[PDB]
């Protein structure tokens, strides 16, 4: 059951580290939108009866090493830039064996509801994934470099579709 589990949310970047930024008139900063996303997901997860730990709760710098918080699952939230502005969509990254089921489960439910192109579940060595024994995934929830993804990253109603689809995946992930 998802109810009673501890979920760690890691909004990427923060503080002096802005993360990626769009080139449009919006001049969006990745650090601002990962944190909005994590705070929204925190509320929805707590309504579902999960305990939520945040690697940061405000616009503060946190080193990758200091993002190693324990839980039953761990979701790193990013809105990175790709060099082609036409590249777009959502990716879920896993690295250790025990992270794959989480990435495969979330990729399936997010595809059903989210308005992002599905770039799939991929194996990649990110330090927040490699440094932890917790089932952890890195979510790219749209690329801030893509103008049309950016319109959805900036939009609470689109974010909330993504956030519900993540909750849907966690409920399947924790079905035992």
């Amino acid at each position: 059951m998802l109810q009673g589990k501890t979920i760690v949310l890691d909004p990427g970047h923060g503080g002096s580290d802005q993360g990626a930024s769009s080139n449009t008139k919006y001049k969006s900063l990745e650090k601002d939108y990962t944190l909005k996303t994590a705070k929204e997901l925190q509320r929805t997860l707590e309504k579902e009866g999960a305990t939520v730990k945040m690697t940061r709760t405000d616009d503060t710098y946190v080193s990758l090493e200091n993002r190693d918080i324990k839980g039953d699952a761990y979701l790193s939230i990013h809105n990175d830039a790709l060099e082609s502005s036409n590249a777009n969509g959502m990716t879920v990254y896993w690295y250790h064996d025990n992270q794959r089921a989480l990435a495969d489960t979330l990729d399936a439910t997010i595809q059903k509801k989210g308005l992002l192109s599905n770039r799939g579940s991929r194996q990649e060595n990110y330090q927040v994934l490699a440094q932890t024994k917790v089932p952890a995934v890195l979510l790219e929830l749209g690329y801030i470099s893509n103008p049309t993804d950016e319109t959805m990253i900036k939009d609470q109603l689109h974010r909330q579709i993504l956030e519900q689809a993540i909750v849907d995946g966690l409920k399947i992930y924790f079905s035992a």
Partner: peptide, 13 residues
């Protein structure tokens, strides 16, 4: 618009 956004959120895209 809002009606379909709701459906994308709680039903399906």
């Amino acid at each position: 618009y809002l009606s379909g956004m709701i459906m994308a959120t709680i039903n399906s895209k």
